[PDB]
Design a protein around this ligand. Structure first.
Ligand SMILES: Cc1c(Cl)cc(Cl)c2nc(CCc3nc4cc(Cl)ccc4s3)nn12
Ligand SMILES: [Mg+2]
Ligand SMILES: [Zn+2]
Length: 312
């Protein structure tokens, strides 16, 4: 009967979409367990195995500016908020699988894109020809699930276990933004022609893929100071990749070229209009209680519009 509790401010604000998990690394495991316990149940996982899993997941994130352990927990918290706001829509295995998938979705990221691994000719690019880093993240997740004392799913049947690992695999693969565009277009058509059916497994898969994009991008749904300071970590990676491209004798795209900092504000506008706003719009159409994500995203677009107008 060992409940996790949070100080009052965190207990109230963790329920909101725009919650920031804060700078105290040591509180992030407890924040995650708190979320598993309320979204899934105190009965979902054996506490000792869950803690051991969380700490090995953490040890397998690297000290990179953006694709780090803080990002993992942040993406899990956005999934927690979606799940808590859409209580009755998700199966017991989905609740179990999706927080784990979010915690694991960038395991062992090096701060480089799929594109950079292909141009560098990294061994992973020969092992996994598409969604290269995402196939790796899922491979690291199965490794950790198979360490002694780390099987958090040990009470599921063979077939339930296979179903949860299949939810996790698909959820992690869906965080490849290259796959997002086509997934969102199909969901838009299905919703607008009324063919969307949440009893159809291949439809559920698409909706979970869209949820994973929404959680992965959730920096654009925070309070503006969080959004703006997170953008600094995102560019610190992209600019390092740009430098590594210049070392291979390749002009990087402007997004990755630190010499073109001036173009960031306009680049953020394209990103909100082409990626983020379409993401949270379709999500809000399918799952109305996720509207606060769309509202926060549009508020951050206006802040980037002010940066261009020289008002910030
Ligand atoms: C906020 C955010 C999240 Cl949450 C996730 C991802 Cl993947 C992401 N990518 C970007 C970069 C968007 C872009 N910047 C630039 C900069 C220039 Cl000079 C030229 C073109 C572009 S296009 N922002 N971003
Ligand atoms: Mg990723
Ligand atoms: Zn991510």
């Amino acid at each position: 009967l060992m409940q996790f509790t949070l100080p009052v401010r965190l207990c109230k604000e963790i329920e909101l979409f725009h919650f920031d998990i804060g700078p105290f690394e040591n509180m992030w495991p407890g924040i995650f367990v708190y979320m598993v316990h309320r979204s899934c149940g105190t009965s979902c996982f054996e506490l000792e195995k869950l803690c051991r899993f969380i700490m090995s997941v953490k040890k397998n994130y690297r000290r990179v500016p953006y694709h780090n352990w803080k990002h993992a927990v942040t993406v899990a918290h956005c999934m927690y908020a979606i799940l808590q706001n859409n209580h009755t829509l998700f199966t017991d295995l989905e609740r179990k699988g999706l927080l784990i998938a979010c915690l694991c979705h960038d395991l062992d990221h090096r701060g480089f894109s799929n594109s950079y691994l292909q141009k560098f000719d990294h061994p992973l690019a020969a092992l996994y020809s598409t969604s290269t880093m995402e196939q790796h993240h899922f491979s690291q997740t199965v490794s950790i699930l198979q360490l002694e004392g780390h099987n958090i799913f040990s009470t599921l049947s063979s077939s339930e276990y296979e179903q949860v690992l299949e939810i996790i695999r698909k959820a992690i693969i869906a965080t490849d933004l290259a796959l997002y565009f086509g997934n969102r277009k199909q969901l838009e058509e299905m919703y607008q022609t009324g063919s969307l059916n949440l009893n159809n497994q291949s439809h559920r898969d698409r909706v979970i893929g869209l949820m994973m994009t929404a959680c992965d991008l959730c920096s654009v749904t925070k309070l503006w100071p969080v959004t703006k300071l997170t953008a600094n970590d995102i560019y610190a990676e992209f600019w390092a990749e740009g430098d590594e491209m210049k070392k291979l004798g390749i002009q990087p795209i402007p997004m990755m070229d630190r010499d073109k900092k001036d173009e960031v504000p306009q680049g953020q506008l394209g990103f909100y209009n082409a990626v983020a706003i379409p993401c949270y719009t379709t999500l809000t159409q399918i799952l109305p209680p996720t509207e606060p994500l769309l509202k926060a995203c549009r508020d951050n677009l206006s802040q980037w519009e002010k940066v261009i107008r020289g008002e910030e």
